[PDB]
Amino acid sequence: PSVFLFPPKPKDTLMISRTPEVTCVVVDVSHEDPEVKFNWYVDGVEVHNAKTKPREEQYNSTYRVVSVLTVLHQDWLNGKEYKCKVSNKALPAPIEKTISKAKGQPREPQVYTLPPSRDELTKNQVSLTCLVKGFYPSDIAVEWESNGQPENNYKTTPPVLDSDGSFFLYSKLTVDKSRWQQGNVFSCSVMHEALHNHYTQKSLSL
Amino acid sequence: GPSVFLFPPKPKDTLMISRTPEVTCVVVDVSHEDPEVKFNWYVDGVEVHNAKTKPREEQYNSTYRVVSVLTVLHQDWLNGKEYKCKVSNKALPAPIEKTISKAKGQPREPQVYTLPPSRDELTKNQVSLTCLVKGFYPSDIAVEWESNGQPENNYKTTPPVLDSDGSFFLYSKLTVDKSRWQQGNVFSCSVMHEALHNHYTQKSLSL
Ligand SMILES: *[C@@H]1O[C@H](CO[C@@H]2O[C@@H](C)[C@@H](O)[C@@H](O)[C@@H]2O)[C@@H](O[C@@H]2O[C@H](CO)[C@@H](O[C@@H]3O[C@H](CO[C@H]4O[C@H](CO)[C@@H](O)[C@H](O)[C@@H]4O[C@@H]4O[C@H](CO)[C@@H](O)[C@H](O)[C@H]4NC(C)=O)[C@@H](O)[C@H](O[C@H]4O[C@H](CO)[C@@H](O)[C@H](O)[C@@H]4O[C@@H]4O[C@H](CO)[C@@H](O)[C@H](O)[C@H]4NC(C)=O)[C@@H]3O)[C@H](O)[C@H]2NC(C)=O)[C@H](O)[C@H]1NC(C)=O
Ligand SMILES: *[C@@H]1O[C@H](CO)[C@@H](O[C@@H]2O[C@H](CO)[C@@H](O[C@@H]3O[C@H](CO[C@H]4O[C@H](CO)[C@@H](O)[C@H](O)[C@@H]4O[C@@H]4O[C@H](CO)[C@@H](O)[C@H](O)[C@H]4NC(C)=O)[C@@H](O)[C@H](O[C@H]4O[C@H](CO)[C@@H](O)[C@H](O)[C@@H]4O[C@@H]4O[C@H](CO)[C@@H](O)[C@H](O)[C@H]4NC(C)=O)[C@@H]3O)[C@H](O)[C@H]2NC(C)=O)[C@H](O)[C@H]1NC(C)=O
């Protein structure tokens, strides 16, 4: 087999109402030795909370077996280490993989909305841009709204490392030019550990 | 045994006839016991004989790394020819074949828009000049900034991102001193992509 260990989604660790989890994915499980055991540890202290998902027979005739561990928001954000220890009869010895939050001082994102270029105003749809810079760690979530309703026609770049060791990204919301021209107000919502209440919003309208 | 990585040309290299685009087939984890490596190269399945293969080089981990480089014609790559590298070695149960080409699809022309700093950014020492490039296909592209003929050092560009209509977009962010912006220096975002006339377009930005 092989073992991959995955962090929680950024949004999930920032809101207590959400449920962040670490996920341990075991691939290339054969039919001849299908028995997978998981042990989990949080800073070396064994914990007992994880659930194994119903496996998927993969299209290469191997099993994908997945364990999910719920994490405390504040444990993840304070940098605790999550160790998944995997065993299987085709493995020489148990594989461990460990994960934790990027290390270092969190830095507050600066959020800037930018209207469409004049040149773009010739098209049927236009691009509303939210630049989010100066943040650390790169874990962040960005969404758009209007009139408190999610606007879902948007795409956000991955975080990119900037020259000062912080990250930036851009999010692009596309809207019908007629919605823009009629003065509708659009909001770029940013969630990040270094924002007050883990959230901020910036408006954009004509 | 050995593992093979096959690398495409850089996007600028296939777009400018002055440049030399190359496909590079790298074999690592070649052992001492079976160190001979043989490459065979194909273009659309037809064998070609003009690659340049370098002697094996031992790595610090006591395996060999062996590289073969095939020059490609600009128009072959841009017409979607498939380049196959086949690597034979006596430790393998069968030769390893790897293939690379430009992503399949009709090319699409990048639309290039420049956007000035947000009003709110103007209380900072440095401001952000943004170039939005969208609607392009395939995703191979190059973006640069300059002012007064000279390249601007401090910019970063996002990877291409797949858009909801199947084309790509990206943004590139040039950081300048607020004073330079304020004095009306003209900056220009230049873009190179196969679906642009002369594989180039440029858009300017100033206050
Ligand atoms: C023994 O040593 C050798 C040599 O290492 C050297 O010496 C040792 C002792 C140490 O000192 C090392 O620090 C030192 O470097 C080891 O050889 C390495 O082997 C690994 C695999 O085990 C290779 O990993 C691959 O790397 C490529 C990227 O490689 C480029 O970038 C590297 C730096 O980032 C650079 O080091 C490489 O030279 C190479 O650089 C490029 O070179 C090309 C050609 O010259 C040039 O044109 C470019 O300009 C230049 N670029 C840069 C940035 O410099 C990476 O792409 C591979 O990942 C793919 O495959 C993975 C599976 O193996 C997979 O998980 C990844 O997702 C990815 O998969 C690809 O995904 C995309 C979709 O996005 C898809 O399109 C692809 O199809 C898919 N590919 C596949 C195959 O599925 C991968 O990580 C190292 O390159 C190689 N090092 C060298 C120098 O050749 C060896 O491991 C050691 N052995 C042991 C037993 O220890
Ligand atoms: C049989 O069929 C199977 C399915 O097709 C196939 O299983 C596949 O196996 C490969 C390994 O062989 C495995 O590859 C890893 O993928 C990691 C990313 O996985 C993400 O994203 C992919 C899509 O990109 C999804 O398919 C995955 O499901 C997974 O999704 C994430 O999962 C959880 C859901 O629980 C979510 O929370 C996430 O939201 C979700 N993300 C996304 C985007 O969807 C990738 O990290 C791995 O890369 C690392 O390891 C490689 C070595 O194997 C390195 O080459 C690579 O460089 C990465 O290295 C790490 O990088 C760090 C620095 O960047 C280093 O510090 C680390 O040390 C370094 N690790 C190293 C060197 O070991 C890796 O590619 C696929 O995930 C898996 N597919 C599925 C569906 O599970 C089988 O192989 C098939 N078998 C055979 C024999 O043919």
Residue numbers in the entry:
A (entry chain A): 238 to 443
B (entry chain B): 237 to 443
Task: Quote the study's own text.
Fcγ receptors are cell-surface receptors for immunoglobulin G (IgG) that play pivotal roles in humoral and cellular protection against infection.
To evaluate the conformational changes of Fc, we determined the crystal structure of the unbound protein at a resolution of 1.80 Å. The most noticeable change consists in the rotation of domain CH2 of chain B of Fc with respect to the CH3 domain (10.7°), resulting in the opening of the apex of Fc near the hinge region by 9 Å (evaluated from the distance between the Cα of Pro329). When additional crystal structures of unbound Fc are compared with our structure, it is clear that the CH3 domains remain relatively rigid (RMSD=0.2±0.1 Å), whereas the CH2 domains are much more flexible (RMSD=2.5±1.5 Å). In the case of Fc, the comparison is straightforward, as the resolution of the crystal structures in the bound and unbound form is identical (1.80 Å), and the values of the overall Wilson B-factor are very similar to each other (27.3 and 25.6 Å2 for unbound and bound state, respectively). Moreover, the electron density of the lower hinge (residues before Pro238) cannot be modelled, indicating it is disordered in the crystal structure and probably in solution.
